[PDB]
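Follow-up to my post from last week.
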Amino acid sequence: SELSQPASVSGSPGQSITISCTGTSSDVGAYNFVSWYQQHPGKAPKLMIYDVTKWPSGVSNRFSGSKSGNTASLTISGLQAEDEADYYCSSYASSNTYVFGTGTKLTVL
Amino acid sequence: QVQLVQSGAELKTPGSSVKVSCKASGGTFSSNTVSWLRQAPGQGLEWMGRIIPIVDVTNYAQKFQGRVKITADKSTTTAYMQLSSLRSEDTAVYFCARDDAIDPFSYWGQGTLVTV
Amino acid sequence: QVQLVQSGAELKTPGSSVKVSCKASGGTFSSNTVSWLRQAPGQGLEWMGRIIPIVDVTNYAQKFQGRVKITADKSTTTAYMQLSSLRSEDTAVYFCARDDAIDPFSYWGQGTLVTV
Amino acid sequence: KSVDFYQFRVCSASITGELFRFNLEQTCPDTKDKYHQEGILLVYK
Amino acid sequence: YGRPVSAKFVGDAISVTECINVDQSSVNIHKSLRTNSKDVCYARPLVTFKF
Amino acid sequence: YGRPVSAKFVGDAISVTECINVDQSSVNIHKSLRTNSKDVCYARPLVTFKFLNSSNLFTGQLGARNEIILTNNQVETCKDTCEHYFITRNETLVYKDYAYLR
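User reply:
Got it. Predicted complex:
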């Protein structure tokens, strides 16, 4: 029951990009411990969004998250820079098991 | 600033046993939980298993039960993961992440590359 | 002079559930036992089961086990019999009887006709 | 009827029986002390 | 308790009910402990009584 | 012993270890006892908590005298008109049938 994520999303400078993450209601619809991880090519994954919408320490505030129903949406407003790290959505599931999304690739011009 | 050390890449024949050792810095394991995650080239991420040394409890995925053995040492603060019967697609990199009061996996290791 | 009141005739589709309520007069059920019997047109008298409310024990026949549910209410002194997965042969007249100091089938009931 | 175990009976009904719990908090308090007031005493005959 | 009672476990508590006697005059005990077939003999004798 | 301890049988002797508490701030108890399928409902409600300040979710079966068991092997057949009573510290939980809360 792996989470489903979009294959890729377009983008442009001075724009906001929204990435969706949906799955079974047993994992995402029963708890509120969703997380988003950014992984650079040939680099360790980095966490930027945890819990529900609370930002972690020492990170940019241009990113936000909102979970409605069975679907979570991560919205980024800070364009330019690199913005090339692949985004993965994760959530807690029953029987002390963790799941991760397929992965989302962000491309910019 | 807890650092993780992972063993170098090793080559093994298909169907053999592969052992990966991960060393955690700092004082001791304490209440932290050590998780293992594999990533294939060009594929996504999945949760293999985790170990909590406070109760010495190992949690495994439903598709990896009875195939992966996880052990921890309270003296050397080292975690050992054994996966025998390695299959071809099994070839992948391996990360030993660590839980943190902020959020789990808050730390990542260098990674171990396994080729079948 | 204990008098028993049975519900009116009801028509239900095959494969449904039929509930029959029998009301017993007097003070209370006490140690008396309530038995449920059926009679097909032109056939003999069958034996569905019995219920004792002073211990709340239901005795069922070896052929009707798992198909008829019997419940009792001491506050209203009412016995409810529910039948499920009935066939086309369930069209019959049902009676609720009442155990007495002499013979068990001392009392009876107007009877309820069930058609499939 | 529960006069005694001598009479044969069958009792397996359980509908609205009274509920009870085991208490594991009672303990013997320690003994108190004694002031034992005292002083100088003189007698006179 | 001095009087016989019946008790069972309900959750984390103990539920106790009352007891009811049966007809002492009409009691029958079978004199044969051999049940039908073989190797399935009853451990204790069966008793038939009214209420 | 006044303090709670964990004990087991090793050979002909009894081996007793120490005990460690969990994060009391993050505790969740499910209000529904209905599991998947039928007639395999859990005997006791499940409890979700964490260990110390570590950010991780752990689900187990609540025991007695505020004890958490990670082996959810306690199952029972579904019974109509059931009733359950549980005691946790200075509070009581009443479960009518196999759901609800009181």
